[PDB]
Amino acid sequence: MVPAPEAIRQALQERLLARLDHPDPLYRDLLQDYPRRGGKMLRGLLTVYSALAHGAPLEAGLEAATALELFQNWVLVHDDIEDGSEERRGRPALHRLHPMPLALNAGDAMHAEMWGLLAEGLARGLFPPEVLLEFHEVVRRTAYGQHLDLLWTLGGTFDLRPEDYFRMVAHKAAYYTAVAPLRLGALLAGKTPPAAYEEGGLRLGTAFQIVDDVLNLEGGEAYGKERAGDLYEGKRTLILLRFLEEAPPEERARALALLALPREAKPEAEVGWLLERLLASRALAWAKAEAKRLQAEGLALLEAAFQDLPGKEALDHLRGLLAALVER
Amino acid sequence: VPAPEAIRQALQERLLARLDHPDPLYRDLLQDYPRRGGKMLRGLLTVYSALAHGAPLEAGLEAATALELFQNWVLVHDDIEDGSEERRGRPALHRLHPMPLALNAGDAMHAEMWGLLAEGLARGLFPPEVLLEFHEVVRRTAYGQHLDLLWTLGGTFDLRPEDYFRMVAHKAAYYTAVAPLRLGALLAGKTPPAAYEEGGLRLGTAFQIVDDVLNLEGGERAGDLYEGKRTLILLRFLEEAPPEERARALALLALPREAKPEAEVGWLLERLLASRALAWAKAEAKRLQAEGLALLEAAFQDLPGKEALDHLRGLLAAL
């Protein structure tokens, strides 16, 4: 049968760490630090079951998933430096445990290892050339999305149009999170992915991001950056956009004035005030409902295409994990 | 065989095209360092190496473009990492732009290097072995940079020659002198001999030592001193200097560039330019250069592209 999710998670973790092993203890420490913080590895699991559902070999699925999880990890090391995040999954960010230059460089080394794994998997016949082209698209789109995200925070004014936000998140997070796993599965099987994988996947991946943003404001276990990190960092989120659209004039102005200040200049009392307002706002409830609406739209767009997947047991798992993008 | 000028032109055009983008601001950010120009010596070495080995010119040009893309994103990140204020007369990318945007630009540039390689492989222009070599290029360079940053950022100066050699072999010698040779063979579907790494690392290292010797002798006066660069000369000096003189040098080196007297630096410069360490360093560079060339002779004499080999030998002799 198909492996259970925990067995896949354990395998991906072992493989990820093995790709980042190094004889220099400090260097190995740097490379493996973020992977060692653990996590559900949802993107990796989606990739493995997507591969199996399309009829591609388990080994090919595991290696492609290992590459995507390596991507997730180096992207977070650099994002934490770029975003000014202090924490990552319960521990200080890498550039707060070590000199920032060493963390920046470690991220580059990890990125190189992702491509090394891809070149090796291709040489062995597990990856068609198209898989490497897909990973190029993954890094290219993600980097451009991060560029748009950073530029928004640093601008003289703030574009609040939903369309601008959705374009950014589609590149920054939605594509690699939900579209790539689907496309990779088809590519590994020598199948041209249907256009619906990107259309439906972007909806699912955007819903995923909205949920991450909700979780960042709430007081649950901090799986990502520090709680309220989006407020300290001036990150655009759908919750913030909806709040600004509905808030009393005084509150809207106060939130926008806070947004214009760099992290260190944001008054602590004002960050606390905004966090309280957002958690109690109709905007938060609206964002949660919006994530579910987008999830539904994505499922609608993928249902017909999923009829063509031969690995039915794997497909059951894939549908379950796609649901987990929003329900967790 | 194309003239160096024609090759430099082609690489520059290909480099900018690989970094063009529909978003003008993003395009400008990615193309910035490339548009600052340069001799593109590593790219030239790669193209002539490809031709010397009998590889198709197009394969040599694309691989060299990838190596020059590597050089550019590495400089972007290096500048952030070491705090360099300027690059070729203008503010560094992370000075001109917010550092986060420059950091990300470097990642995007690195992504395009692999995109170029992946597309070349898909078209049948590159064998997978070429991508494995680029993986080695980034892997070694990053580890070398890790060592150099570790020492520099934390004020460590008591390093042995062995430490210097290990760091420079990884940080610079490999991608500068070894990769162009191995890539040439790989692009032609040939197995690179072990001499390419052994001889290439010696040449690439000799290259660095001579440059450091130049900054001290010829010509600001001795810029590597105000920066406290861990050169073989400075490390050898410290390895042998008497307690009092060693203490004085380290005291000066402990101070940031912006806070060290011209007189105190001039003092160190005087002792270095006339030290046995400087003489030893020069001899080491000459030894390594001669050994490196000798190791490569047999393989070179058997290469099919004689005209290209002429150019290759010439570039390696200069450096």
Q: Which two tokens stand for residue A296?
A: 């539904």
Q: How far is A293 from chain B (nearest CA, A)?
A: 31
Torsion of CA B126, B131, B137, B138, to 10 degrees: 130
DSSP string, chain B: ---HHHHHHHHHHHHHHHT--SSHHHHHHHHHHHHT----HHHHHHHHHHHHTT--HHHHHHHHHHHHHHHHHHHHHHHHHHT--EETTEE-HHHHS-HHHHHHHHHHHHHHHHHHHHHHHHHTSS-HHHHHHHHHHHHHHHHHHHHHHHHHHTT-----HHHHHHHHIIIIIIIIIIHHHHHHHHHTT-PPPHHHHHHHHHHHHHHHHHHHHHHHH-----HHHHTT---HHHHHHHHHS-HHHHHHHHHHHTS-GGG--HHHHHHHHHHHHTSHHHHHHHHHHHHHHHHHHHHHHHHHHT-S-HHHHHHHHHHHHH-
Contact at CB, A147 and B112, closer than 8 angstroms: no
CB A169 within 8 A of CB A184: no
- Give residue for tokens 């990796």: A44
Q: Cα B303–B304–B306 angle (5° rounding)?
A: 90
CB A210 within 8 A of CB A286: no
- Give the list of residues 6+ apart from residue A63 with CB closer than 8 angstroms, or none: A15, A117, A121, A126, A127
CB atoms within 10 A of CB A202: 24
Q: How does DSSP classify residue A194? A: P
Q: Identify which of A167, A20, A142 has the alpha carbon closest to the alpha carbon of residue A75.
A: A142
Q: For residue B145, which residues of chain A lie inside 8 Å, CB to CB?
A: 105
- Nearest residue on chain A to B75, alpha-carbon basis: A105
Of the candidates B77, B131, B146, the beta carbon closest to that of A119 is on B131
B104, A151: Cβ pair inside 8 Å? no
Chain B contact set for A135 (CB, 8 A): 114, 118
Chain A nearest C-alpha distance from B194 (Å): 21
Which residues neighbour B211 within 8 Å (Cβ) at sequence distance 6 or greater? none
Gap from A232 CA to chain B (nearest CA, Å): 16
Any bridge partners for residue B86, and if so which?
B91
SS3 state of residue A92: strand
Task: Give which of B78, B97, B135 to mutate to test A binding, by max A Cβ within 10 Å.
Answer: B135
* Partner-chain contact B108 A143, CB within 8 Å: yes
Q: All domains of chain A, ordered by start, with CATH?
A: 1-328 (1.10.600.10)
Of B25, B122, B143, which is closest to A27 when you measure between CB atoms? B143
Residue B161: name the closest of B287, B257, B256, B319 by CA. Answer: B287
Experimental structure resolution, Å = 1.5
For residues A168 and A148, is the Cβ–Cβ distance under 8 A? yes
The residue of chain A with its CA nearest to that of B128 is A123
> What is the token pair recorded at B214?
């130049």
**CA-atom Rg of chain B in angstroms:** 20
8 Å CB contact of B135 and A119: yes
Largest CA distance in chain A: 62
